[PDB]
Design an enzyme around this catalytic site. Structure first.
Site, PDB file in Angstrom:
ATOM      1  N   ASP A  42      10.285 -37.919 -36.370  1.00  0.00           N
ATOM      2  CA  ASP A  42       9.225 -38.755 -35.815  1.00  0.00           C
ATOM      3  C   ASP A  42       8.069 -38.920 -36.791  1.00  0.00           C
ATOM      4  O   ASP A  42       7.306 -39.889 -36.691  1.00  0.00           O
ATOM      5  CB  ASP A  42       8.722 -38.161 -34.500  1.00  0.00           C
ATOM      6  CG  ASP A  42       9.842 -37.891 -33.517  1.00  0.00           C
ATOM      7  OD1 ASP A  42      10.874 -38.591 -33.583  1.00  0.00           O
ATOM      8  OD2 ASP A  42       9.691 -36.979 -32.679  1.00  0.00           O
ATOM      9  N   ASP A  88     -10.691 -25.478 -25.442  1.00  0.00           N
ATOM     10  CA  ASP A  88     -10.052 -25.717 -26.730  1.00  0.00           C
ATOM     11  C   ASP A  88     -10.151 -27.177 -27.147  1.00  0.00           C
ATOM     12  O   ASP A  88     -10.287 -27.462 -28.342  1.00  0.00           O
ATOM     13  CB  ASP A  88      -8.595 -25.263 -26.697  1.00  0.00           C
ATOM     14  CG  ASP A  88      -8.459 -23.757 -26.672  1.00  0.00           C
ATOM     15  OD1 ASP A  88      -9.500 -23.070 -26.606  1.00  0.00           O
ATOM     16  OD2 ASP A  88      -7.316 -23.259 -26.721  1.00  0.00           O
TER      17      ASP A  88
END
Lengths: 309, 304, 306, 310
Positions: C87, C190
């Site tokens: 990918d 995060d």
């Protein structure tokens, strides 16, 4: 990490298999053929002893005639059985746990189809494994069990479950609304499809389907997992084994609830009824193949697909 | 469970460089030195340009025996610890004591927090009750972490986090449990936490709330690559070993309680066990009620 | 949907680093030359010593038309893109084309991957079929991202997602997300991920997002380890305009990455504006979008497999 | 999208739950205001049959000035031009169930919790109603699921249009369910567990949210598939294009039947040979919003669901 030590050499073994299963008929006889060849008493449930295939067969010999009937009448004594051998899936082990409501002899479960979680041993080359578990020592896991008392407003019933206790709805469509107390303090109110109170053994059971974390069966704890909670913030809880849960219907609950113990004996809970859950003093010793950690992780990898690339 | 009597030795820990803590601290000391207690403070605490310059508090500051982290004599000379501030102060206090930890009585001035059950309002009565020795205690277990690359040993209260750190391109890390390779984490990283850390960073990663009286060790993946990496719970007696995968390209970074972040490369291993020196935390009323109250007020757990 | 009229020129993209792609690349280029096709390659692969230093290629290597990244507007210059590798190759190809993208066919050599449906085995028949305009395409939507500093602006285009996190710094992020000028929320933790449906199975999936078929017009917002238990990934219409910026009370910067390439710092006053780009990537599927997507779900990220 | 009236609305329909009692005064006030505003008011026959609404001397004039709403002939003759709902989201679900074809714009009021489908507040209702009568009020075209059940006994077929979701579960029996789920004739998977939910974006915050689905803005054209307690750790909710044709049917190896419920009502059993076909209804429900679709959706998400509150 406890080795199986025998105070005296085992001589009586109870064999339990799933009924109405032809595929289990052939192995079972063979197992008994080995157990009689080992000069050991074999206990069999009288429910399957009368099966036409078991009785009307050429495999009668000195095995069928020596099939001592299990002391299903009342309870007799659990010391009459040294260890238990189960054939089938985890349901057979749950049935064996249900049979012994007191001290449970060590259980050696065999799997014939899927590996499962409570059936570590494989029936292939079973003679060597049985000889090793009889003469030598094998690692055992003391899986804790839940002691449950159901009180109807006051009739009292007592059960001991191994996987979990599920309080949910039944034929009703309205989401259940119950209250959970811990040591007499109202810890929370569960609104939604229901609640699951499970042992670490049941962590990989139906409780896992509800988002609970996989817990090794050597962790002393009790898991509370909501089945489809109405709130987004409801996260599964893990509480100490020594606590005493009490689940009731909220005073404003319009309808009733339904409680099931290991998926059987589903009964209705109405206003004034309570469910008291503690950690039982009679854990089930399950015999492991190599060691508790390796067996548990292998079952996680195979029965589930935990962390597969 | 319950705590014994209390001799005359108090260690006070406060968050450095915070003006809002100036007024309570001295006030607390004013009550501590009032009856029978001896107040220990850090060397930096006496170095503050405002604590020492207070003429009114200067008389009290004379009897301010400085706490030096020299040897076990410091631990034997302290009966219990009073913390002012958030949970970071209690983490700092845990880091100070790498051996036996005296009971910790933590106060909160802003948010309630999980490790700060007491409230500074009407603190005199609570402190007197603690002195009388009628307060519940939770023995929060801690993790003993050994990094081998030279060896270093750490005592961790919340958790240890292994991640990409300053680098990127998430790597592969192998987790060994009692010498057996159990899994290989692929993703943002892994968290090895104690039950006290269950409501910490580990909670943000999808872990389950665990009561601090449960003896266990939690392994929680930070953004695992697979969809079936559910967080797991293992017995406290196991010995985790964490190493970089032999096929890994880039290194990883390990942090203990969010501090002392250091790099882990090939040939380096992290050994995690359950420490035999748990931190005793003083409870307001009882462990269960305090834990559930903190869970409801801080995380808004099951608020609806 | 299907499409036709894809003759003549074809661009070929492969992993720049030398790997086992050399032989498949040579075979594909030889077959394309045999089909009277024009093969475009980037200048990087021509300078590769392994490709240039062989007598087997010869005329085929001599016929490699170089591909100018931006010197010439490649509107009709490239009518077909063939990617070799994972990918990452498709992401690189998307990065190369910041405007209209020609239809893209991707082959996989290792893992199947979501963005590489075709298999290199028996590639001649597949290439012949795709030349004859007998394949179905998926118009994967892309994100148009503008980063505003404090005056200069950027014009990134993203296929998978944009990730805002703490970056090299260690302190957790505290950012604010607005939609159409209205403050959606504050992300503490995060970080945050703004993704297309194509990126749903990407890094966004690791954060708990739901798998979204690439034919759904939407934008996914997914928190990376949110500080609150109730933060759940959300899906918003493609027509909205997200704006992400540091909170005025933030004491430290953040870091933004576009498909994990441009890890650049975001400070106070900087803003990130995200919209749905009007230049989608026309990926080419083997059988049909639904079947290929579910096959990729079954293979790549083992999903509902029992 | 904003309200655009070809002609000024004159006939409105008022829907309320016929079991509550606190709604009587708001219903009476709303009806009196609408009558004062030269409007025709429609109610169901059960509302007129209520012993409390009819037995009011003050309300008698407007009660006699009412106009009963026949369940049939409303699709052929678009008499209703504007719908007002009093109560929770269940009232709006009932209103959606009433209209199986084109749905007039719906203005829902909440009296207890804010809810999700009830954007407006009854306080100062007169000004809001006056504004919505002719003023441009933003609307959300909430898509609905057309679900037809083919039951094999030459097979009777029913048809429903749901707004929240369709739930296939183990019903009032059994322990697990194994149902094969297709898409355009291609077998997607075999849902094995407590069950499956096929929901619209409107239902993303409904029961589907409790099962772990993702919040989806009602302006996203999609269909959500969410497993109720799947037996595998890897089952994650799917979002598929609105144009697909889902087909759910019992596995050929299944032993026990399943049960299907549409918005919590008409719970009926599904046996071997029966199939459920789910598509986009093409008859969306227009719900009138207060300020703006995005702002109202996020306000409801923050209040009713406590989404990301710190």
């Amino acid at each position: 990490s406890q080795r199986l030590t025998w105070n005296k050499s085992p001589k009586s073994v109870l064999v339990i298999k799933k009924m109405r299963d032809a595929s289990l008929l052939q192995p079972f006889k063979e197992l008994c053929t080995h157990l009689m060849e080992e000069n050991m008493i074999v206990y069999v449930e009288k429910k399957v002893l009368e099966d036409p295939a078991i009785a009307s067969d050429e495999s009668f010999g000195a095995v069928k005639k020596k099939f001592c009937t299990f002391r299903e009448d009342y309870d007799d004594i659990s010391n009459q059985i040294d260890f238990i051998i189960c054939l089938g899936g985890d349901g057979t082990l749950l049935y064996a746990s249900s049979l012994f409501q007191g001290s449970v002899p060590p259980v050696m479960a065999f799997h014939l189809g899927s590996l499962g979680f409570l059936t570590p041993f494989s029936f292939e080359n079973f003679q060597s494994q049985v000889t090793q578990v009889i003469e030598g020592n094998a690692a055992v896991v003391l899986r804790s069990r839940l002691k449950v008392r159901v009180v109807k407003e006051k009739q009292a019933m007592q059960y001991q479950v191994l996987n979990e206790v599920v309080i949910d709805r039944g034929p009703s469509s309205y989401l259940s609304n119950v209250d959970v107390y811990l040591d007499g303090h109202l810890i929370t109110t569960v609104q939604g499809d229901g609640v699951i109170v499970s042992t670490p053994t049941g962590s990989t059971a139906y409780a896992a389907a509800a988002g609970a974390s996989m817990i090794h069966p050597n962790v002393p704890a009790i898991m509370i997992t909501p089945i489809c909670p109405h709130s987004l913030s409801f996260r599964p809880i893990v509480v100490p084994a020594g606590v005493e849960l009490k689940i009731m219907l909220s005073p404003e609950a319009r309808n009733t609830a339904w409680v099931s113990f290991d998926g059987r004996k589903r009964q209705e809970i109405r206003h004034g009824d309570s469910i008291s859950i503690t950690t039982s003093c009679y854990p089930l010793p399950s015999i492991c193949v190599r060691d508790p950690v390796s067996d548990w992780f292998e079952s996680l990898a195979q029965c589930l697909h935990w962390n597969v690339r």
